[PDB]
């Protein structure tokens, strides 16, 4: 019922000497909409949101370096690595201003880029995004020991790299409805070879939890500082119970952030796109027409 196909012609562009894959549809009339996925997804996660937006706006959805159909160089796949590649991807497309639609680690990339380039951002729609997590008590109990293991020396790489737990297990556990075997094939494909799973493991180790990694905590705090000042139009989707963003936090941010509307998508964990793609895509399209 929720679409499982990926009916988008591949686009490729060389970025720092590495080929990155992206979706590019819609009319080049006006401001393009840049969709940024997180862990462990790809542009596949936007496949049922894009068709609501492409009738009126150009839609661009890259696969992060080391993910999706993009090349897979020997990197640490730290956040800093993703910043370098995403900075250069956006410059390769010869764009000017954009609207961002961002999720999970794609939201850290998007917010950090918007803070450094605010004249180029005409709106941000965001969901289940990277915020500072003061203590492990704010991580959902049902996932807490596993994410602590992900961040434990030796233990975490055995789970994520050798056993592929983030794809086989954490991914479906971040979706309320069951994922199909075709959907799982699309998500599993980039990571069928264990040596290619480094980004799946480095990302949970980059989460800003209880002050560490200090560099991530600092950068995320700084773009949240910017978001609390900037007049940029903001659209916050949120679900219950969520994962990164509990309902109480969405409610706080909908009052504190300027020019922000919050949208309740109903039941949702992390991949809100997979539980209510039609509300998310439809409401982004309505919101775009008011900018
Ligand atoms: Ca090359
Ligand atoms: Ca650790
Ligand atoms: Ca299933
Ligand atoms: Ca602050």
Residue numbers in the entry: 3 to 293
Question: What did the authors write?
Answer:
The self-labeling protein tags (SLPs) HaloTag7, SNAP-tag, and CLIP-tag allow the covalent labeling of fusion proteins with synthetic molecules for applications in bioimaging and biotechnology. The three most popular SLPs are HaloTag7 (HT7),14 SNAP-tag (SNAP),15 and CLIP-tag (CLIP)16. To guide the selection of an SLP–substrate pair and provide guidelines for the design of substrates, we report a systematic and comparative study of the labeling kinetics and substrate specificities of HaloTag7, SNAP-tag, and CLIP-tag. We complement these kinetic studies by reporting crystal structures of HT7 and SNAP covalently labeled with rhodamine-based fluorophores, providing a detailed understanding of their substrate preferences.
